[PDB]
Amino acid sequence: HHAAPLPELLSNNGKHALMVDGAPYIILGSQTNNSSNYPDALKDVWPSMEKMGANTLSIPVAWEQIEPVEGQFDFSFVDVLLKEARQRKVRLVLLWFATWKNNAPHYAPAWVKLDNARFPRVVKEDGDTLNSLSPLGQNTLAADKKAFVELMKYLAKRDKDHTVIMVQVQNEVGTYGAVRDYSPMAQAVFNAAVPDDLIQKLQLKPGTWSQVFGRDADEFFHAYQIARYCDEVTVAGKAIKNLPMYVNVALRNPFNPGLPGQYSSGGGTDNVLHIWKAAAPNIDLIAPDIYFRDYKTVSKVLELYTRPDNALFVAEIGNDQPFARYLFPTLGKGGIGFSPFGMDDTDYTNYPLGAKVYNDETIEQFAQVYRLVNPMMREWARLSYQGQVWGVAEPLDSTTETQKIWNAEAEEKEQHKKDRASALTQQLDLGLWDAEVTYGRPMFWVTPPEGNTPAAGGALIAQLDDNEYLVTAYKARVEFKPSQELAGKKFMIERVEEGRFEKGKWVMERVWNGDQTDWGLNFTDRPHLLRVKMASYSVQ
Amino acid sequence: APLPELLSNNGKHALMVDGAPYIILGSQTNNSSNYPDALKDVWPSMEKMGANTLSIPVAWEQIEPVEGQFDFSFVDVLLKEARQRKVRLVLLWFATWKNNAPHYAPAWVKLDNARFPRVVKEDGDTLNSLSPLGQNTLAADKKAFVELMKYLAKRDKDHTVIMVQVQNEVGTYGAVRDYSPMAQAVFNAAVPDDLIQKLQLKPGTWSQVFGRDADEFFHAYQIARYCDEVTVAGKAIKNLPMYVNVALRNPFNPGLPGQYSSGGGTDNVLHIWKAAAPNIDLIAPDIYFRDYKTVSKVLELYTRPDNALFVAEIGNDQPFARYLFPTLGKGGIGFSPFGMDDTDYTNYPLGAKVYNDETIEQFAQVYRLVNPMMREWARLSYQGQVWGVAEPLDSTTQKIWNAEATPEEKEQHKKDRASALTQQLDLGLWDAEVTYGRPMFWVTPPEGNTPAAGGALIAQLDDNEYLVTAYKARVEFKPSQELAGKKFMIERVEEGRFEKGKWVMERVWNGDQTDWGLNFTDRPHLLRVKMASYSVQ
Ligand SMILES: *[C@@H]1[C@H](O)[C@@H](O)[C@@H](O)[C@@H](CO)[C@H]1O
Ligand SMILES: *[C@@H]1[C@H](O)[C@@H](O)[C@@H](O)[C@@H](CO)[C@H]1O
Ligand code: NA
Ligand code: NA
């Protein structure tokens, strides 16, 4: 009665897919608050997930809850979770909160986190101790592995249709307040030769850590040791059940990071991705956690984490209104998923990170974008993997009260308007055709774009054939034109159809024509999925 | 079922109801709701409030409208309707005094001055305040009070009525004492031996013994004796707890007796009251001061080794709700907001200008923190260690000065406010810091709620374990003493509830929910917090 293929992350042609039930899949995700991982809290999780239209829930499973006393395992939460997820026909990503949760051992059992002699903490260069477990603690590694193995044996036994499609190993590893462990135990490894395997993979000359890496030795050392720790846990679990597994990064600012220890040292930050990929070959991907609000910073993060060797998964993102539009470039980069944080009614907000008020309007900002993708999820996922997709978001953030003042003053207003219109105009090269995406304009005539208030728009395009595209967009205009000069030919829209996929087959609902195609393709907040066919034609 | 009883032991107190400590999460009616037809306008509010006990008058005029012709028809209906709703009652005996006056004494009492005489001023004019030296008045009040207690003895065997208030706000406005010939004959004479013995003073006349306090202390003594005799007579029928409620003088700047209600249990005569009326179980403050400092001072003065704290009347406007927390943290046995019914009356500017669902909800939200643990809290308060705090700045009035202010005076002002909105509690090995009006994430300093509203309750369960619930506040734990090289953490925070006296865990708070203290909004959460120190060397 259970014949479904394991989920798997595939990588080729520099592109990636999360295979679920034997085909590409997109996680249109929701993630709970940090204290929702108990049976009694789930009634405060599912309603939000339904309102959001999410297909996949990310939720912790804590070491402390599965092994409250050493060797006495308790999977009562996982049992209820699996059953309730199945009732609602959603899938799960389990977050293993264990040796590290945001740098710290708070979710390790008391017999772990209160026994430093057995399970040692990072020691600073000055001799003081931080509440961050050292990745050189061999007992810690053994005990985390043992518990993780038991979790994976529970899923092997009790989740044969793979309700759980992926597992996050740890949560935001690293250390705040120091660059590495400086304990005697750590110093002995630091003072010794860099392991051959790393030297070989990075194509460097042999030496000790300080000799090989200079001023980067302390940070690279901590990243290597954490990555090896996480890889060993990962390998042990996959030996039981070979699900995709990943780590999530407490990001450093990519333009102005500050110093390791200010940001979480040793996690998969952009400067140690090479270390993590060398050190942890069994981990499937390294996922950014995004709480930067501004378009330029978010865009840079998506660029850094989308690599031929690294599928893009936005494992955590804020739940305030500005964040919703980042679904569009995430999917346009070939991303496999997107998981806004704090999507439950458990009476907590991490404002000022996320939304100040958690209510139906908060959820609706995400529901409105997920409604663009849900009706085509499998078709999009395949085109993303096997084809050409594009995706953009509105590239100016909302005007501040600062800019609000500097506007009341200003001939200057007119130039500013021109500059904003240009910035709110995006070009995409789709082969024989280009698209121009603009934001915040009427659905008729050609008044320049002025942006949405607040910033919110975006667009998704997939290429179906040389002259045919799937298009859906949000609070935006999409206009097509030839990509190269036509040698005396004219061009037009040949046909725009609005429709849907049913059992993989396109069903046309209506043709957009006349006013609906004279002024580009204009989208509001409501979902429309279009197939657009362009033509060039001779006039003699 | 066992009689309710007020216990006092080890300077602590409990109201025992059904053989265990109980907290009155009270509602009190308006003054004209003591009739069967009005009760339909009382119960819906009580239900919305989540109150467990109703305080309501029973008037001498209604039970004895004609001398010797008793009528308990209201008491019957009340008992039956209270039982239907599974709530308890505190009956307020409105008789010789209600707010200094005899308006609730039967017409055959209050219109017969020669039989039942009034206070006479020094100048010979008469006040509408019955003299405590009227022996007829004492006998008549006592007789009727006895009949009421007989009704409860015969008709309330399960003690729906758990306590009785004897009179309401006794004393006299407009004069310090009775200066009638009858009163002068007693005043111009020896202080009674018993009072001299209990205060350890030298024998003499009132004037000799007490000097410039004589007049006021005389009035307080004679009213206390009156109230004790009524009390004793009633308890001899049915030995319920019985108390008196005080029209407070301002504790910082009282003015003169007569301006405030002279002779009641004001803070300067609590020694007289305790000496003269040993059968009265407690003296309860009636609080209509809105401001934190005065309210706090009142709670301090009335919480004594010899006096259980019962807030027998408090305003029903929004600022008053948060005073439940310090009341319970002092080991108070109850709290009773006034005017909780829909009988088309507001005592604004004392209470709320508007009575509506929002008015009630400000109290419902704090009662919802206590109801789920009421019996457990009550036992901890008596037998153990509890604490409770309220947000210590009132709502900003001040906004003129904040407007005219340098961006140096302002940053100074926000720092001063942050410090004032930070409270420290010494819980033994561990301290708690309580702050008000800040996000649930990071450490931006407190700026207070608007309006002021927050508070916290803590009970100690063990050396390192506390029961915690709070409201629009952050609670953070730290070691109370330097740890000598050890570190510390929260070991475990559990949200849960008591079922059959047993703790049931619903979820564990961790991660974001414990990284930045324990953050509470308007919604109820009951936590068990276990702290640990641990070696790193
Ligand atoms: C991301 C992190 O993974 C998550 O558990 C939570 O701590 C949030 C903040 O609310 C982020 O730090
Ligand atoms: C307190 C008093 O006991 C009560 O009956 C009522 O008169 C109020 C005012 O509305 C307070 O004086
Ligand atoms: Na092209
Ligand atoms: Na449609």
Ligand code: NA
């Ligand atoms: Na008590």
Ligand code: NA
């Ligand atoms: Na202490």
Ligand code: NA
């Ligand atoms: Na101390």
Ligand code: NA
């Ligand atoms: Na609860």
